[PDB]
DNA sequence: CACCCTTTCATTATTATTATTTTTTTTTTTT
């Protein structure tokens, strides 16, 4: 069908590291679908792959999904996020005297440990996010239509939607070639701002140990 | 399921942010070198989408509480005022690890990543505490999705939604509030106020050439120690300003709602602030929401009484050898 | 069609969409806010809704005004399910008139025909009457319409049936008797004020059902002024002067009232030096007045003035000063700025409601300050895509031309903007409507244009009403001049420019050939809540509404499709300015082309 | 060996910071 998509936020969210796939989000949204409709105690390996998008084969084996990453155009200024995470002592200290705590340190640490604070910096961007894939458009939108969030799932308040928009464009104007790609993709597949890294291409794209060797766009 | 919670401080609001902001005595922000400034913590902002004005979008500033503060501000009342007394009436000691579990965010039960099965995954997300935040070396998804404290703002307008444009204020929400700390030996007026301090006169003397001897040296050098005698600036929100409270819980059971739901009943006595010293983040509860539903009362909740009896047979049964589970 | 509503077989297709969304909203008991243009049908649609709620069982109330009545029960005559289940009208006082006071004119002033009428029953004359009393089932006797089509020149407010009148007289027997049309049939027609004033009945503690299934709404911007219009009590000074002739306490009332261009706006209680023990006396002297022997209609003034004193006393309203048009006459209003408890009160009272209007959404889909004004909670608020076609835009040609100078009501200004009418004037093909926000622009546009255009112009002022101007518009339009019209107030909003001899063919429609928008309509609406929901807000509202208006003024070119060589000027030059604040006046003008 | 103390090491270096400029109308058909 060839479509394009895009999601427009009723809250800042996390700039990402590396690439925010379509995949990855439809694939979430797919394991929280099946979360509803089985129950909490199934395989999230199952179902991330259940998706209504087209699946690339290299030449060589090292398939992908045909989605190409969320190009970013940004409304807001990237500006920056700060949290930072304690354990509350004054409480530890009561709780330590009426018993209901077991301590035996009689002293915290803020470097490091149970009682540390630490503080952290993440990007903040407000942004118009297109992405542009092959597959049914129904199942895209029953899928976005439970994403509230994209981005962080952050539980604590980020990347809230205000919408999401899928239409048909023709073939010459949708770039899916930019997305992480495998080294064996094909000549009129690789471009100049692909460029050859250890990226995963599929699935969860912060699982580690299924990166590969990859060839693929920057943000 | 969602939880609306629409609060009006009683107090002012301050949650502190970072970076080095200079304000000077009249009240200009981040002056330009040259003249003198001063230190100011400004309360928390983030610059959020406009579409007030034009139909193009502007970059405005808003002034907020993080949705972290939030997120364990509600964790801290459940465990100050229902958690801890079920605990400590049944007799149960946490471990430092599994109280760091349950207490923050943190991950010292075991540094090392815990591998996790879908079952003990399952039967750790529908624990009527555990499973809202999660949290520890599983670093499973909590169910519990705090939002930031919104203000009902114009600049948020697009955070806030449609619906809010009665009641709702604009203009600057900020005020530069002025502390100061003045060196008390300063302040010692006699024989009887200074009998208390052993050296009494000679004591207080010697501080008072010492102080004199560092603010003449440190105005000689302009021209590394540091007194007592401050004066500082911090901008905080203003009270009686109300707020909105997104609590969007994805795939909740009855206890967990039923928790939440006493955290709102108890959180009367709690603060939200950077100001405990001089009681900001005071603050009622005036509506609560439920899927769209109010059901806060004066006399706190009325409504809701399955969750109510949820959440009374969940602390009921609670043994803290989930926590400890929970944790390794 | 399959699977239609009933009725939807005679709804334009491009409404089709709206209508099935809206009937579903409304079928989940939300209140659906639905927008569509001027000339394409919202009365069919309407009906198809009326008719598709009636079937499930559902207690249907349709709210409009009552020129959009006939036109209403026009689309709710010939389809069989409200034929079914019967169709009815709610009227109040002001649709009647007082038989022994109009016969006491028409002898006075030698009216033949108003006298026979009268004796007789005042059987209906009108076209109108007569189906409507047919479609009701219940005879419409003693209309003011009808008793005005043979005379104009009467005195309406004079001859009015007011609630002091006898109870033998036949026209009040015929309302109370009436009163009781919701029982006998499954839709039943009101106006907004009949809709605020039942609810004012509701919430102080008959015409309408205790509990609305399903509303329509007709017109639903207007909805809000109207339960604006009711819950202000006016007292009115000279009238009751004239009838206690026919105290000093008042007249010290006066005298204190003179001390308070700002008279005390939006002040519920801010000074009240002499203001509640005057009352207090106004009140006590009005009430305490013999009923014998004191006139019968003497006492529906006496009752006004003591109901809108009542009003002023309690202090949980505000009071506001305003003078009349012919003199500076002593107006005191004690009207409510905040309507949420009323509003809300007729909202749980209604199980889903669908609002159409021609402006009732702000930008795209963007409907906040509508449920705003009316107040509709935001749970049950359902906001629909509206529907813009390009035959509203197609036929009509934006000018580039404008007047240079800044709209800041100098001379110099009419002076070069009136250039511009003459010149405007001069390629007109047809009528020209000139639209203004203020009396004294349009009596400079006047000065400016007296000599030059002669027989040729309108004007409107304190002694020119909108309907006589209008009036005015279609004589000589008819003796085959071509009119310019300094129309304001209400030609802005709410005038049928399209012409009605010429029914079938819209191509050859020339009565306005030329809209010219001398100025942007800001600072419009000074009404209470407007003020309060201004003050909350900011600049936006007054933006947004200056919005609003502005759409209604430039809705007056086309009013159905078909139409060709249409004409569309605006002189403002803060709109072909580097100004941001006109950027949505732009917008606007960006749907047109060149 | 799980519970803590307290030691230890590290190389460059600079500093900018969004905030606004109405008009004053007389409508409508309630009790």
Redesign the interface.
């Given at each position: 069908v060839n479509l394009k998509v895009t999601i427009d936020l009723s809250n800042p969210m996390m700039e990402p590291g590396d690439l925010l796939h379509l995949d990855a989000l439809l694939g979430a949204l797919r394991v929280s679908r099946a979360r509803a409709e089985h129950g909490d105690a199934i395989n999230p390996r199952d179902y991330h792959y259940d998706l209504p998008l087209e699946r690339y084969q290299a030449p060589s084996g090292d398939w992908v999904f045909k989605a190409s990453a969320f190009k970013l155009k940004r409304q807001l200024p990237n500006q920056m996020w700060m949290q930072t995470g304690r354990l509350s002592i004054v409480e530890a200290a009561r709780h330590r005297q009426s018993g209901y705590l077991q301590l035996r340190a009689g002293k915290p640490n803020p470097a490091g440990g149970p009682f540390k604070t630490s503080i952290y910096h993440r990007p903040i961007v407000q942004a118009e996010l297109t992405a542009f894939c092959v597959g049914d458009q129904q199942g895209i939108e029953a899928l976005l239509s439970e994403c509230r969030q994209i981005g962080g799932k952050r539980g604590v308040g980020f990347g809230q939607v205000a919408g999401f928009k899928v239409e048909p464009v023709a073939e010459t104007d949708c770039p899916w070639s930019w997305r992480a790609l495998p080294a064996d993709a094909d000549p009129r597949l690789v471009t100049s701002e692909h460029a050859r890294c250890i990226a995963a291409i599929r699935g969860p794209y912060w699982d580690r140990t299924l990166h590969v060797e990859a060839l693929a766009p920057t943000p | 399921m969602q939880i609306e919670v629409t609060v009006r401080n009683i107090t002012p609001i301050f949650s502190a942010?970072?970076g080095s902001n200079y304000i000077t005595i009249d009240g200009t922000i981040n002056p330009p070198p040259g003249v003198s400034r001063f230190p100011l913590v400004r309360t928390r902002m983030?610059?959020?989408?406009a579409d007030?004005?034009?139909?193009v979008?502007k970059?405005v500033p808003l002034q907020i509480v993080?949705?972290?503060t939030?997120?364990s501000l509600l964790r801290?009342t459940m465990?100050?005022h229902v958690i801890?007394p079920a605990?400590?009436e049944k007799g149960?000691?946490?471990?430092?690890?599994a109280?760091?579990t349950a207490?923050?965010?943190?991950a010292?039960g075991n540094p090392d990543g815990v591998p996790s099965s879908?079952?003990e995954?399952?039967t750790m997300?529908?624990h009527p505490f555990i499973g809202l935040?999660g949290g520890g070396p599983r670093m499973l998804?909590?169910r519990?999705?705090?939002?930031?404290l919104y203000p009902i703002h114009?600049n948020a307008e697009?955070?806030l939604?449609?619906?809010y444009?009665?009641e709702?204020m604009?203009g600057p929400i900020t005020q530069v509030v002025w502390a100061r700390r003045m060196d008390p030996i300063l302040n010692l007026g006699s024989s009887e106020d200074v009998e208390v301090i052993n050296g009494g006169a000679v004591a207080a003397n010697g501080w008072i050439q010492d102080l004199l001897a560092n603010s003449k040296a440190a105005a000689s050098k302009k021209k590394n120690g540091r007194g007592l005698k401050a004066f500082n600036a911090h901008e905080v929100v203003i009270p009686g300003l109300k707020w909105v409270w997104?609590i969007?819980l994805?795939?909740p059971t009855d206890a967990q709602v039923g928790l939440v739901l006493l955290a709102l009943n108890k959180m009367t006595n709690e603060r939200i602030a950077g100001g405990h010293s001089k009681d900001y983040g005071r603050f009622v509860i005036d509506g609560v929401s439920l899927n769209?539903?109010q059901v806060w009362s004066q006399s706190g909740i009325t409504g809701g009484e399955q969750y109510f009896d949820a959440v009374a047979e969940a602390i009921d049964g609670l043994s803290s050898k989930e926590f400890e589970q929970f944790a390794q | 069609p399959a699977d239609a509503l009933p009725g939807e077989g005679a709804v334009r297709e491009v409404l089709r969409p709206l209508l099935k969304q809206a009937a579903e909203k409304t079928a989940a008991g939300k209140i659906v806010f639905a927008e569509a243009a001027t000339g394409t049908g919202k009365g069919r649609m309407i009906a198809s809704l009326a008719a598709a709620a009636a079937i499930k069982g559902d207690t249907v109330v349709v709210s409009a005004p009552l020129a959009v009545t006939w036109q209403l029960v026009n689309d709710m005559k010939d389809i069989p399910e409200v034929r079914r289940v019967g169709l009815t009208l709610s009227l109040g006082r002001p649709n009647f008139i007082s038989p022994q006071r109009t016969l006491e004119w028409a002898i006075d002033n030698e009216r033949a025909d108003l006298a026979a009428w009268i004796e007789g029953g005042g059987k209906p004359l009108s076209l109108r009457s007569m189906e409507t009393s047919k479609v009701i089932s219940h005879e419409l006797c003693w209309l003011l319409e009808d008793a005005l089509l043979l005379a104009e020149d009467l005195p309406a407010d004079s001859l009015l049936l007011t609630s002091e009148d006898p109870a033998d007289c036949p026209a009040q027997q015929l309302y109370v008797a009436m009163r009781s049309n919701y029982t006998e049939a499954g839709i039943i027609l009101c106006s907004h004020f009949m809709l605020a004033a039942h609810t004012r009945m509701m919430q102080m503690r008959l015409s309408l059902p205790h509990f609305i299934d399903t509303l329509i709404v007709d017109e639903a911007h207007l909805l809000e002024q109207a339960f604006a219009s009711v819950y202000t009590h006016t007292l009115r000074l000279r009238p009751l002067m004239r009838t206690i002739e026919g105290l000093d306490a008042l007249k010290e009332l006066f005298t204190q009232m003179q001390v308070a261009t700002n008279t005390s706006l939006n002040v519920p209680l801010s000074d009240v030096p002499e203001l509640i023990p005057a009352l207090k006396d106004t009140v006590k002297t009005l009430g305490a007045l013999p009923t014998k022997g004191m006139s019968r209609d003497a006492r529906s003034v006496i009752r006004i003035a003591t109901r809108a004193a009542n009003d002023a006393l309690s202090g949980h309203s505000r009071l506001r000063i305003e003078v009349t048009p012919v003199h500076s006459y002593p107006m005191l209003l004690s009207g409510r700025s905040n309507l949420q408890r009323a509003l809300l009160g007729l909202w749980n009272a209604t199980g889903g409601a669908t609002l159409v209007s021609a402006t009732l959404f702000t930008t795209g889909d963007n409907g906040s300050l509508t449920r705003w004004k009316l107040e509709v909670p935001t749970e049950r608020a359902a906001f629909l895509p509206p529907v813009h076609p390009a035959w509203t835009t197609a036929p009509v040609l934006l000018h580039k031309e404008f007047c240079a100078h800044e709209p800041d009501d100098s001379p110099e200004w009419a002076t070069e903007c009136a250039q511009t009418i003459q010149g405007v004037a001069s390629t007109a093909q047809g009528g020209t409507l000139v639209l203004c926000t203020s009396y004294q622009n349009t009596e400079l546009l006047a000065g400016r244009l007296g000599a030059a255009l002669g027989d040729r112009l309108i004007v409107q002022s304190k002694t020119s009403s909108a309907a006589t101007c209008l009036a005015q518009f279609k004589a000589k339009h008819k003796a085959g001049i071509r009119p310019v019209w300094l129309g304001l107030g209400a030609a802005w909003t709410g005038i049928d420019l399209s012409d009605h001899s010429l029914p079938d063919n819209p191509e050859l429609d020339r009565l306005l050939s030329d809209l010219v928008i001398t100025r942007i309509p800001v600072g419009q609406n000074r009404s209470l809540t407007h003020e309060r929901r201004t003050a909350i807000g900011g600049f936006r509202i007054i933006s947004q509404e200056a919005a609003w208006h502005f759409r209604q003024g430039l809705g007056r070119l086309v009013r159905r499709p078909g139409v060709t060589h249409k004409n569309l000027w605006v002189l403002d030059a803060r709109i072909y300015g580097g100004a941001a604040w006109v950027a949505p006046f732009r917008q606007i003008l960006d749907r047109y082309k060149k």
């Open positions: - | 942010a970072p983030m610059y959020v989408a007030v004005g034009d139909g979008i970059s993080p949705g972290n939030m997120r801290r465990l100050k801890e605990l400590v149960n000691k946490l471990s430092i690890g109280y760091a207490y923050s965010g943190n010292t879908f079952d995954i399952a997300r529908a935040f998804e909590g519990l999705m705090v939002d930031s114009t697009r955070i939604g449609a619906g444009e009665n709702m604009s997104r969007s994805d795939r769209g539903e | -």
